[model samples]
Target: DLTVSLIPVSGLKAGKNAPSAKIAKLVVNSTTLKEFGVRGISNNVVDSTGTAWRVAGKNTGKEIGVGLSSDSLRRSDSTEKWNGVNWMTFNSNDTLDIVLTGPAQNVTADTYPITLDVVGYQP
Candidate 1:
């Protein structure tokens, strides 16, 4: 079995695809699975005031664009689903670094919750 845990990020600035102050780390509990992939789920990110962040180019005043990147692969929207071609292999105690992108407009500095769906396979 595989377990996934997320380390939240903070101190994000407002800009065009701005990266977060800290990287989101995904920790797997066991190495039983050899392959894994991460997918950004619905309402993945939200502001301090509970406002959901929008996809790229959909930023309005309160709405901002958000994206996720890992190992040179980037997913800006839910449509870009992960598959076997993009799934990453894992080792014992291995961790994955996930970069979160912020909105283009300046908003309050608050803790943003990032959501993701992680899947693992054994073969």
Candidate 2:
């Protein structure tokens, strides 16, 4: 079993139909599905330095099984998976960083209290 969360930067303007990519850092639990990772489109952040926080997954632990989501909605392409690497992975047991590229989210909001409707389930 696996669980993930999407956390946005406190104050910023995510563009309209923003084209973004990501590298996720995740920790596994409830199963041997270690070394889980994903790629191919998700939430992104462009810093003042014009650096994009995207394109790599930081993962650690053992390899149990490879899995993929049915894919939550957002951009034209949204996909994440196990056997995941790009950011990097380890065989040791340790928690890692994370990133999400897309979900039905807004570029801007009236208030910080944004309610996102999500459909996260194992495929």
Candidate 3:
């Protein structure tokens, strides 16, 4: 029973290298995008359960990255409109850090909330 529907970049702390969590089957959702092509998105997640992932999509681009400990989840195609996430798996009780980054902003004004869904899971 885990579902965290909304989390902002401002909601998380400045984590470097790696971090850890104690919850099981936890899901943390980050941001919402009403518009697009404003700027690239970046996120870092470190979990100990070794079970988590991120998935996001839009008209521009979409992706899914899954791994244990640390990972980088983002678009496979480096286009201006490309953005989103990925998923992964690992053993129990090990911690990992994740770094996700999208293409740079296309220098436009069409942007807003969770333009995509970036989240973590422990299941």
Q: TM-scores of the models, in the given order?
A: 0.50, 0.25, 0.22
lDDT of candidates 1 onward, in order: 0.46, 0.29, 0.27
What are the per-residue Cα lDDT tens digits for candidate 2 across 2-117?
45454444433442322232223343343444433333232442332111233322242111111122231121122343344222222223333332334533333222221222
| Residue clash pairs of candidate 2 | 23-56, 25-97, 25-98, 38-81, 42-101, 42-102, 43-100, 43-101, 43-102, 57-87
Worst 10 residues of 3 by lDDT: 104-113
Best by TM-score: 1
Per-residue accuracy of model 3 over 16-72 as CA lDDT, tens digit each: 212332111223323432211111232523333223434333433444332322232
True lDDT of residue 121, candidate 2: 24
| Per-residue lDDT of candidate 1, residues 1-101 (tens digit) | 77777775555454433443334666767656655555554443443311223433233423334434444233212222244234333443456565544
Better of 2 and 3 by TM-score: 2
| Predicted structure 1: lDDT | 0.46
Cα misplacement distance, residue 8 of candidate 1 (Å): 1.8
Off by over 4 Å in 2: 13-30, 42-87, 90-123
Candidate that beats the other on TM-score, 1 or 3, i.e. the better one: 1
